[PDB]
Design a protein around this ligand. Structure first.
Ligand SMILES: [Ir+3]
Ligand SMILES: [Ir+3]
Ligand SMILES: [O-]
Length: 148
């Protein structure tokens, strides 16, 4: 299974991997001043990183199924989409584009939020295309989608 990372960037199990260079997650990077939940209408800005915003500190954008969005998070997170927890699906009606995530397969995916509330990824590179929905969350932990 795909490893989780602590807020110092240390792998909590398994072996560490690096993120895709074209991911919106840029490491290394601090986080974890507070766990800050936000609404999808309220997703943080580039502008918000050093200041924070009215809702609190901002280390970027985290997401897990629900959907639940966060602008900072302190506990274990994925740095790559745990694709063993995703299943092939037809493209959905997208409500929001939220970033460019590394897959546990090492590829780059665009990540979207669907109108049905599902989190969906679709291969970013030309060729070898896939469409997948985040269906299981056995460690109930978010992906760190973007760093500010
Ligand atoms: Ir949009
Ligand atoms: Ir994009
Ligand atoms: O920012």
């Amino acid at each position: 299974m795909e490893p989780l990372y602590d807020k110092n960037g240390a792998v909590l199990f398994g072996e560490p991997s690096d993120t895709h260079p074209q991911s919106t997650l840029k490491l290394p990077h601090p986080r974890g001043e507070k766990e800050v939940i936000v609404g999808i209408r309220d997703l943080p800005r580039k502008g918000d990183c050093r200041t924070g915003n009215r809702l609190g500190p901002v280390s970027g954008l985290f997401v897990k199924p629900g959907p639940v969005f966060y602008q900072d998070y302190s506990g274990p997170v994925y740095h790559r989409a745990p694709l063993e927890q995703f299943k092939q699906a037809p493209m959905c009606e997208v409500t929001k584009r939220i970033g460019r995530v590394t897959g546990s397969d090492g590829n780059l995916y665009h990540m979207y939020v669907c109108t049905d509330g599902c989190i969906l990824v679709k291969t970013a590179k030309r060729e070898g295309q896939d469409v997948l929905k985040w269906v299981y969350n056995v460690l109930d932990s978010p992906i760190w989608v973007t760093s500010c």
